[PDB]
Each structure stands twice: as C-alpha cells, then as structure tokens.
C-alpha cells in the first residue's frame, strides 16, 4: 500500500520542473510513498492526454479543471478520489470543490494553485489624478470617460495573439449571465445565437469606446508596456501575464480590482481563475500509495512549497499566506476566494476547436463592433459549434 507510483508531469519548464520534483522527495517524506517523476514535454503531454489515459499511464498525473477533467471522467478513464476529499475536503472552499467534480458529482481533482483574470492599474497614478477603484459599472465607465478627458486611454488593449480577447468575453458573460449560463454555453448546452449572447457583445459595444485603438495589430506585452509606462490608466488580463511583465522597479506601483459589477444578481461572484492539479488515471497503478500522495498535495503545506519560486499563482487552501507571496499574490487570494465558483478561462472551459474558433470571431467582432457584426459572429459560432459538439 505504499509501493513506488510514477508521476506523469508536463512540469517541462526548468523553475516548475525543480519545484514538483522538491515537492514529490517532501510527499515521500512525509506519506513514505517513493515517487518516480516521468517528465514529457509540456505541449505534448498536453497533446496526447486522451491516449495517454486509455494506455498505460502513471498512478497519477498532472492536468486542470475545465471541459475536458469532465470529458475524461465522463468516459471513465478516471479514478474517482472521494476518499482523498473525505481526508482533504475541510481545506477548501466550495468554488474548489466545485472545480474538483465531474459531471457525475465524484471528486477527481485534487487542485494545487491558480492566478486571477483582473483590472491592473498604477496607485501612484490613481492617487495622483483623484480615480477611485469603480466597484459598479456605471463607476466604471465614468472612470474611463474622466481618463480620457484627462488624456489616458481608458483600457490598454491587445488581441493579436488571439486569446487575450477571449477573457472579456469571459468576464462580460459571467457578469451578465452568470457562471451556470457560461458554463451551459461552453458545453453548448445553450447556443451562440442566444440572446444572452447578444447581450454580452452589446455590453462589449459600449466597452470597446473605451479600448485601446489597433488592437488587433497589438500583442499583450504591448499593451502591458502602455499600463506600464503610463499611457494607459488600466489593463484587463492574467496576473501571470500583466504583472509578470512590469520591471521589478515599477512592480511595487501595481495592484489591481476585479472587475465591476453589471448585472447585481452575479455580483462580482464569478472569476476566470486557471486552476492547475493532478489526476488519478483509472488505468495507472498502485491507486492506493497514489491516493496517498494526492492526500499529501490537497495540503497548504504542498502548495507552499511548490510556490516558494513562483511569483504569481496562489495556492486554494484555506487561510494560506505563503511566506514567499508577493502583495499581488496576496490579493490574489483574497479576492479569488471570494468568489462562489471559478471558471478556467475560455480555453479550457470549451473544448479546444471551440474558443480557436471563437479567437477569430472575437477579432472580427473588434474590427467591427456593430449589431450586423455581432448577428454574423453570432451565427457562425453557432454553425462551429453543432460542428464541433456533434
């Protein structure tokens, strides 16, 4: 019961890949479980799951939450862990384990860390010309008519790498509709010809007077100089991307609020929030000794020690400061587990060939933000869609 597992890792990269194999020699320390670590390539670990899973995987593996943990547990290709979540449950929040089940209700998750979708703005540049954090989109929007009176762009904005645009999307329809609707639209369980759907394009109409012009000709890190340098009074994105990319010298200026509030039945109760963590593969070996180790990984315990080296995501266990956590990262905590649910952003809560469909429609909708445009977009992500989700 407590015989070497293998691990299948896509921790590919050099600072990650150190942090899991640190974590696995204090797992083992700790439950007596050896663990043998099989590395593959990030992307192409990412590329084979599905043969991965009906081979001969490991006793455990690294993947996240969103469509395709479900698809998986949908096909019976994973292990149920409610006996983990018997032992770890009374750690986590319910936004965690909600993003921990399958369709089915049964836990098959064991989540390590995540990082926020937010509004990132400089404090000095705040304080300095009177803005108050906007907590309403009527605030918001008054905010950014004052930006550009004062002669700022109100929101850097950037979609030339296709995925950046998605996450307004994202954060319009959870405001709007609420994260049960987003959901049912991702697994298209609603279609994109749903006025829900219009609504959230016809909010983006009002939005994009306020958005960096050229933006499909702009990369994020562009527009994250623009924040940076202050041409800009804000930026919507991933905190492992905006704030990864200030200079150490400005970082201290940078801090950041969600985003506002439409539709007062959802609040501010819903975020984009990439969850990274592990799976047990129902065809791996030794479930035993591996439920053992995945008990030890749903600990704050875990989560700060494979944090210490990373300067953005933030563990899910309750009450967990790390040591190492800069003030974003803690912020992110805060505000991220104050959220009822969590969605995984668009790429990982549809399937693949649906938000890639979605990038392009995206940026048509942003070259032309008109009623005709949004009627197009509208019925050939549809079209994709029964493609698609036949």
């Not at 990269?13 to 670590?37: C, G, I, N, R, Y």
């Given at each position: 019961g407590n015989g070497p597992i293998t691990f299948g890792s896509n921790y590919s990269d050099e600072a990650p890949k150190a942090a899991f194999a640190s974590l696995m020699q204090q797992a083992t320390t700790s439950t007596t479980v050896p663990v043998t670590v099989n590395t593959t390539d990030h992307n192409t670990f990412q590329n084979n799951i599905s043969n991965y899973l009906q081979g001969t995987p490991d006793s455990l593996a690294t993947w996240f939450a969103g469509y395709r943990l479900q698809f998986f547990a949908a096909q019976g290709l994973l292990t149920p862990i409610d006996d983990v979540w018997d032992k770890?449950?009374?750690?986590?929040?319910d936004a965690a384990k909600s993003l921990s089940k399958g369709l089915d209700g049964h836990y098959y998750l064991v989540p390590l860390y995540n990082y926020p979708w937010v509004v990132f703005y400089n404090k000095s540049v705040f304080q300095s010309k009177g803005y108050e954090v906007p907590a309403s989109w009527e605030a918001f929007i008054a905010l950014a008519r004052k930006m550009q009176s004062d002669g700022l762009v109100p929101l850097a904005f950037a979609d030339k790498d296709g995925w950046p645009a998605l996450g307004t999307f994202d954060i319009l329809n959870l405001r709007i509709n609420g994260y049960d609707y987003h959901i049912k639209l991702m697994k298209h369980e609603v279609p994109w010809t749903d006025p829900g759907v219009t609504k959230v394009f016809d909010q983006w109409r009002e939005l994009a007077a306020y958005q960096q012009k050229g933006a499909n000709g702009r990369t994020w890190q562009d527009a994250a100089k623009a924040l940076e340098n202050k041409q800009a009074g804000m930026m919507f994105q991933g905190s492992n991307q905006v704030a990864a990319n200030y200079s150490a010298k400005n970082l201290p200026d940078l801090d950041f609020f969600v985003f506002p509030a439409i539709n007062p039945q959802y609040g501010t109760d819903y975020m984009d929030a990439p969850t990274d963590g592990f799976i047990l593969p129902k065809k791996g070996k030794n479930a035993a000794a591996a439920k053992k180790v995945l008990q030890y990984i749903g600990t704050a315990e875990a989560e700060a020690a494979f944090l210490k080296t990373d300067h953005w995501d933030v563990g899910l266990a309750n009450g967990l400061i790390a040591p190492t956590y800069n003030d974003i990262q803690k912020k992110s905590v805060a505000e991220i587990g104050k959220c009822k649910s969590v969605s995984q952003f668009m790429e990982r809560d549809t399937v693949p060939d649906m938000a890639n469909a979605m990038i392009k429609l995206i940026q048509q909708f942003i070259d032309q933000p008109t009623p005709e445009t949004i009627a197009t977009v509208q019925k050939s992500a549809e079209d994709q869609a029964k493609t698609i989700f036949r």
């Amino acid at each position: 019961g407590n015989g070497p597992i293998t691990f299948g890792s896509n921790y590919s990269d050099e600072a990650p890949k150190a942090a899991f194999a640190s974590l696995m020699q204090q797992a083992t320390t700790s439950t007596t479980v050896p663990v043998t670590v099989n590395t593959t390539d990030h992307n192409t670990f990412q590329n084979n799951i599905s043969n991965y899973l009906q081979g001969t995987p490991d006793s455990l593996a690294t993947w996240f939450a969103g469509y395709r943990l479900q698809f998986f547990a949908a096909q019976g290709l994973l292990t149920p862990i409610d006996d983990v979540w018997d032992k770890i449950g009374g750690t986590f929040n319910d936004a965690a384990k909600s993003l921990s089940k399958g369709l089915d209700g049964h836990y098959y998750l064991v989540p390590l860390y995540n990082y926020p979708w937010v509004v990132f703005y400089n404090k000095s540049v705040f304080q300095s010309k009177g803005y108050e954090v906007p907590a309403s989109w009527e605030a918001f929007i008054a905010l950014a008519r004052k930006m550009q009176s004062d002669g700022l762009v109100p929101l850097a904005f950037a979609d030339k790498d296709g995925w950046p645009a998605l996450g307004t999307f994202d954060i319009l329809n959870l405001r709007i509709n609420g994260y049960d609707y987003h959901i049912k639209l991702m697994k298209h369980e609603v279609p994109w010809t749903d006025p829900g759907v219009t609504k959230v394009f016809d909010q983006w109409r009002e939005l994009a007077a306020y958005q960096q012009k050229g933006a499909n000709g702009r990369t994020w890190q562009d527009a994250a100089k623009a924040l940076e340098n202050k041409q800009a009074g804000m930026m919507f994105q991933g905190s492992n991307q905006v704030a990864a990319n200030y200079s150490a010298k400005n970082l201290p200026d940078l801090d950041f609020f969600v985003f506002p509030a439409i539709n007062p039945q959802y609040g501010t109760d819903y975020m984009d929030a990439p969850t990274d963590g592990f799976i047990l593969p129902k065809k791996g070996k030794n479930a035993a000794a591996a439920k053992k180790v995945l008990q030890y990984i749903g600990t704050a315990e875990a989560e700060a020690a494979f944090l210490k080296t990373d300067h953005w995501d933030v563990g899910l266990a309750n009450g967990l400061i790390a040591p190492t956590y800069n003030d974003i990262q803690k912020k992110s905590v805060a505000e991220i587990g104050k959220c009822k649910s969590v969605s995984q952003f668009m790429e990982r809560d549809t399937v693949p060939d649906m938000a890639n469909a979605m990038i392009k429609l995206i940026q048509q909708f942003i070259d032309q933000p008109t009623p005709e445009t949004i009627a197009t977009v509208q019925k050939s992500a549809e079209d994709q869609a029964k493609t698609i989700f036949r």
